[PDB]
Amino acid sequence: FXXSXALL
């Protein structure tokens, strides 16, 4: 969840 892991 929350995108790819780049930002979150």
Residue numbers in the entry: 1 to 8
Provide the authors' own sentences about this structure as they appear in the paper.
Novo29 is an eight-residue depsipeptide comprising a macrolactone ring and a linear tail. Novo29 kills bacteria by inhibiting bacterial cell-wall synthesis, with no detectable resistance occurring upon serial passaging. We also report the X-ray crystallographic structure of a hydroxyAsn epimer of Novo29 (epi-Novo29), which may provide insights into how Novo29 binds bacterial cell-wall precursors.
The crystallographic phases of the higher-resolution data were determined by molecular replacement using the KI-soaked structure as a search model. In the X-ray crystallographic structure, epi-Novo29 adopts an amphiphilic conformation, with the side chains of Phe1, d-Leu2, Leu7, and Leu8 creating a hydrophobic surface and the side chains of d-Lys3, Ser4, and (2R,3S)-hydroxyAsn5, as well as the N-terminal ammonium group, creating a hydrophilic surface. An intramolecular hydrogen bond between the main-chain NH group of Ala6 and the side chain OH group of Ser4 helps enforce this conformation. In the lattice, epi-Novo29 packs so that the hydrophobic surfaces come together, with four sets of epi-Novo29 molecules forming a hydrophobic core. The macrolactone ring of epi-Novo29 adopts a conformation in which the main-chain NH groups of (2R,3S)-hydroxyAsn5, Ala6, Leu7, and Leu8 converge to create a cavity, which binds ordered water and acetate anion. Inversion of the 3S-stereocenter of the (2R,3S)-hydroxyAsn residue of the crystal structure, followed by geometry optimization of only the side chain of the resulting (2R,3R)-hydroxyAsn residue, afforded a crystallographically based molecular model of Novo29. The only difference in structure is that the side-chain amide NH group of the (2R,3R)-hydroxyAsn residue hydrogen bonds to the carbonyl group of Phe1.
